[PDB]
DNA sequence: TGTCCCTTTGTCTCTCT
DNA sequence: AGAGAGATAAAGGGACA
């Protein structure tokens, strides 16, 4: 008999139980824990279900699931019930910060290292607890924290990095490797190739930071001679998430894409310059002719779709959905391209296919409005949030559908919609902003934190901003969101 | 296997002008 | 507004006890 059977059965017995109180998990959550934390994590969740749920710790099931669903999840759960009160009461962290540190493979190691090293990192090395938490909150967090403790001086003094730069490099999975590689390659990349430390930090500050730095060292000469690529272009390919894989793929596919399809090197660099850039390039090589036949999509339109994170996913999804969306839903090919040409284009496209009928029919939006909401990063999230929140926003808060669509139609649309739902009443009733002013603040990228900054100034006024009327603060918030408010405070004093 | 650490890819959100 | 940057996450491999 297949040896995995007894454990699978154990897994399923314990799982079915967790569907009960006090966690009541769903198949999705159960699968998630089983898939990364394994049977051991599922059993640990059950055994610890009562101790995590309410007082003392009072963790939500989502938080329990977030902690359990990683390699060593059982170890992280044990450690969180032990160290959460310590970290909150002895170092002044929030439960949310503790849970963030915990929710990665080896979370136990991260938690224990934060407990051990936070004081020396803050006192002796000058970091804030926020910076320590960010460093800790990735797989290998323990290694990154220990490497920051060891290398912070040499990186700032011998190599000229700011502590902020060191923190940014550390704050990725594989942070220890990136830090060590920067220490070794910074003078090589700067002195031999004329890169600024800023460009080096930009290359290093991503997962696979080590790999991207070594690949830039190895490939920069070859790429900047034989392929007429500029150093700026190579840095961009390396620093945008594509890392080592994107660089090696550009070396392979630049001449193929240029010669065979007439793409420009600028176009190839743009396709390369994202997470999964390698995947995007190879998919363009494969799919451009299939999409561009019959005067179908133009090359330019294909390049636009490809030129985002997950470009490969967007491309393949366009190929799948272009005909059904255009025919069955009446969208233009142009509109499909629009929807597809953002990070997560696949998700947005699939969500439009699914929700365009319902938003139009059940909520009285136009297809144009659905497309407008869909055509931003996180479009899927904004579409599903419009579906959920249109009746409460309109019926209870008095907003028009047009205003809801406008809030929804930016990156972070979901966040802006939820925040308006949350804060409209205190902003309007308690502080006399008009709904129109609230909608104006929220109808930009960064809508949510702009609203929260405003609410904060009205609820605990900082004298630094007290010379501005609500109307002026509203104008400021619309102009430049939370950062503009923060910037103005700095100006005051 | 369980746990830890690293790398790649994909998705979402905010900033910066 | 559209590029750049960072946050959050899934999932696979190396390593080792």
Numbering used by the authors: 231 to 723
Text of the article:
Each TAL effector (TALE) repeat comprises 33–35 amino acids and recognizes one specific DNA base through a highly variable residue at a fixed position in the repeat. The crystal structures of TAL effector (TALE) proteins bound to their respective target DNAs have revealed that the residue at position 13 is the only one directly involved in DNA base recognition, whereas the 12th residue stabilizes the proper loop conformation. dHax3, an engineered TALE protein, proved to be a useful scaffold for structural characterizations. We then present fifteen crystal structures of engineered dHax3 variants in complex with target DNA molecules, which elucidate the structural basis for the recognition of bases adenine (A) and guanine (G) by reported or uncharacterized TALE codes.
When the natural TALE codes were discovered, no code was found highly specific for base G. In light of the structures of the DNA-binding zinc finger proteins where positive charged amino acids such as Arg, His, Lys play a critical role in the coordination of base G, we made a dHax3 variant with an Arg34, His34, Lys34 in the 7th repeat.
